[PDB]
Amino acid sequence: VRIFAGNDPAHTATGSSGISSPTPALTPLMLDEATGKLVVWDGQKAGSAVGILVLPLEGTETALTYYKSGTFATEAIHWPEXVDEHKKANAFAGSALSHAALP
């Protein structure tokens, strides 16, 4: 049940939430360009996951807390269904986040 796969500090940040339904912790997040808010990462593009949710949401919150850095265990993250294995590997590329198999 280990969440990290590396020792680099895992810093958190807050942001405006566009999530409108319950969402578990360790969900990757992306920006919604129409609103500028953070929503669940849809898996469509590598590099567009900009955060990993820290606290579960109920879907009513205007703000959320996310990890903006750290190295996560791949298996701990709640990935979107259907995600492409390469886009999953490189979900966070370009941010300070990364992930790796423990395994």
Add this chain to the structure above:
Amino acid sequence: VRIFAGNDPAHTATGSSGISSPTPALTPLMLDEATGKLVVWDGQKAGSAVGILVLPLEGTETALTYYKSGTFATEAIHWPEXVDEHKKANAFAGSALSHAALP
């Protein structure tokens, strides 16, 4: 007059500047895609602010210094006029920068 709202190290970087007028410190920056240079963040998109200016510019400089990490106090940053509250909250999402209300 506190500039930071968190303890994560605030690292700086240098970059090529496209700014041609005086600009105060703690201004968010974006890339200009036509030139590749750093300019003032226009507020149009969340996640496109890639830096926060460290030293004031006069507008003649070919290079600038910017913060590439850290957690800033929202009120300390010199935001662009008109900015959308959500795009402002998520200005830096995807970078190692973030900001929060002290308040």
Add this chain to the structure above:
Amino acid sequence: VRIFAGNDPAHTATGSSGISSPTPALTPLMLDEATGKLVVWDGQKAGSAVGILVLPLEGTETALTYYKSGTFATEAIHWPEXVDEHKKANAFAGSALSHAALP
């Protein structure tokens, strides 16, 4: 032969590789949007270099290791031929990476 130009920790990450030919260490990387894999940064856009290769590749590897943070010496990096001086200066803007002249 110094590779770093600053003291901020240089963290590494792994990612899915789309590189199919030998590639030296300290090569900047970008995402290929069609596949989601990491490939050599082509120099076309500032901010699209998301990593710097840590280990040389032979071109057969499905995964690679890259730096996701740190301040590099400009001269140590293996830049793409033809790169624009401004796009080169700002190659990594928006990531936790940066570079500077030692010189």
